[PDB]
Swiss-Prot record, chain B:
Attaches the virion to the cell membrane by interacting with host receptor, initiating the infection. The major receptor is host ACE2. When S2/S2' has been cleaved, binding to the receptor triggers direct fusion at the cell membrane. When S2/S2' has not been cleaved, binding to the receptor results in internalization of the virus by endocytosis using host TFRC and GRM2 and leading to fusion of the virion membrane with the host endosomal membrane. Alternatively, may use NRP1/NRP2 and integrin as entry receptors. This is Spike protein S1. It comes from Severe acute respiratory syndrome coronavirus 2. Changing N49Q: Reduced viral infectivity. Glycans are attached at T29, S31, N37, N49.
Length: 49, 49
């Protein structure tokens, strides 16, 4: 997820409000990245035998 | 790009791999504003012609 776009992106005024929450969605961008990596490792364990 | 990675990872050294550091989005180059036309065309020509 582009969490800027998801909450309200391409807007100066929305960005200024989104930024008052710091890393509130950054941590989820990281959580989804971690999940995608785990899913790739999982695919390799099943098929690259 | 290497320094995008170094700050994302909070490090002065980088291990082999791919790191997501940001997002890019294409912005508008022009604005397309369209409102419908009036069916009943205006008789200005009845005073001028």
């Amino acid at each position: 997820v582009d969490c800027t776009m998801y909450i309200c992106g391409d807007s100066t005024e929305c960005s200024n409000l989104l930024l008052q929450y710091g890393s509130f969605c950054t941590q989820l961008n990281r959580a989804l990245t971690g999940i995608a990596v785990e899913q790739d490792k999982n695919t390799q364990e099943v098929f690259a035998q | 790009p290497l320094s995008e990675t170094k700050c994302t990872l909070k490090s002065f050294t980088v291990e082999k791999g791919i790191y997501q550091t940001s997002n890019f989005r294409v912005q508008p180059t022009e604005s397309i504003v369209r409102f419908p036309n009036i069916t009943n065309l205006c008789p200005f020509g009845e005073v001028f012609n």
